[PDB]
């Protein structure tokens, strides 16, 4: 799609010049996008997962895997092996198709949107942004949603540093806070 | 958790003993085991 073509033709040659790499193989790319929904109210409500899956299914376009509890935790009333979340890993076209829709369409629909933060890099050039409403995604219908619930969206990149990752994401339409 | 006998379904010979949990396995357990009489692997079933 347009963003993959934009990456190869425009962004990657620019980053080569920008950072003055020896090889084109050094140019940072987006590896994968992991979308996570933590669903701790699955402890209480059994159908919370079934719903949360269905939302994430349409948003991403792949069937999510249902994550389970690594430990029992008393504070949360969590037992080991309980379904308490759902992730989906996006690579290739399904990744760029998603990331295009995120930037082009969904992040505009965020209520009172004033850019995504410049702080939210991990220190090694991976970006994570927290969505609050699943209503922003155009596949999600307003009427069908009952329980409102957000998600984490990890953008993993081959950038070693934040400034290299920042550049790549800025070169994509991603609206960083001015 | 209880002692069981597995009788060969062909000849009827009570060939094996074993244990099972009745809570976990309430129905009569079945296994394919060597029957010395029949000189082959036959289905054996928990005795009623």
């Amino acid at each position: 799609n347009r963003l993959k073509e934009k990456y190869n033709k425009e962004i990657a040659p620019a980053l080569m010049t920008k950072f003055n790499y020896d090889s084109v193989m050094q140019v940072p790319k987006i590896e994968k996008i992991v979308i996570n929904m933590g669903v701790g109210d699955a402890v209480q409500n059994a159908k919370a997962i079934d719903s949360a899956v269905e939302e994430l299914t349409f948003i991403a376009g792949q069937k999510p895997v249902v994550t389970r509890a690594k430990k029992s935790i008393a504070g949360f009333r969590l037992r080991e092996g309980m379904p308490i979340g759902a992730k989906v890993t996006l690579r290739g076209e399904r990744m760029y198709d998603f990331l295009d829709k995120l930037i082009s369409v969904s992040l505009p629909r965020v209520r009172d949107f004033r850019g995504v933060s410049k702080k939210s890099f991990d220190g090694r050039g991976n970006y994570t942004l927290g969505i609050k409403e699943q209503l922003i995604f155009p596949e999600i219908d307003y009427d069908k949603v009952t329980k409102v619930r957000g998600m984490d969206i990890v953008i993993v990149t081959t950038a070693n540093t934040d400034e290299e990752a920042r550049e790549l994401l800025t070169q994509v339409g991603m609206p960083f806070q001015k | 958790r209880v002692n069981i006998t597995l009788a060969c379904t062909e000849c009827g010979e009570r060939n094996y003993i074993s244990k099972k949990n009745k809570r976990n396995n309430p129905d009569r357990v079945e296994f394919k085991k060597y029957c010395p009489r029949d000189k082959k692997s036959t289905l054996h079933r928990e005795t009623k």
Binding site: E31, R124, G125, N126, V156, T157, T158, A159, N160 | -
Partner: protein
């Protein structure tokens, strides 16, 4: 960042796992496979002495195959190592799949090697 693991480093762990239960003697040597991106290679080895007895690759000029990568090349290589084995007086071997899944090119080599003579 994402530090990727070397496919070969992963393979060598898998190969070590094979080689724990499997090794060549002079009487019954080890038909090892190595499968590169471009080529496929077969060595017949005994591990007590540590010596290759026969070999065959897609680098051999005897093969007049177009694609060295594909399964058809593996069948040609599997024949040729089995022929060269029979010259040295080798019938029985153990197949060392080299960490690779017993599938595709590696299986194609193994199946060709059987038909050509070698007993496994």
């Amino acid at each position: 960042m994402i530090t990727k693991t070397s496919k070969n480093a992963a393979r060598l762990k898998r190969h070590a796992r094979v080689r724990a239960k499997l090794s060549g003697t002079a009487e019954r040597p080890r038909l090892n496979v190595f499968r590169s991106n471009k080529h496929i290679y077969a060595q017949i080895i005994d591990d007590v002495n540590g010596v290759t007895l026969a070999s065959a690759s897609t680098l051999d000029k005897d093969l007049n195959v177009e694609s060295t990568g594909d399964t058809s090349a593996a069948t040609k290589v599997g024949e040729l190592v089995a022929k060269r084995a029979a010259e040295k007086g080798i019938s029985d071997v153990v197949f060392d799949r080299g960490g690779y899944l017993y599938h595709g090119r590696v299986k194609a080599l193994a199946d060709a090697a059987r038909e050509a003579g070698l007993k496994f």
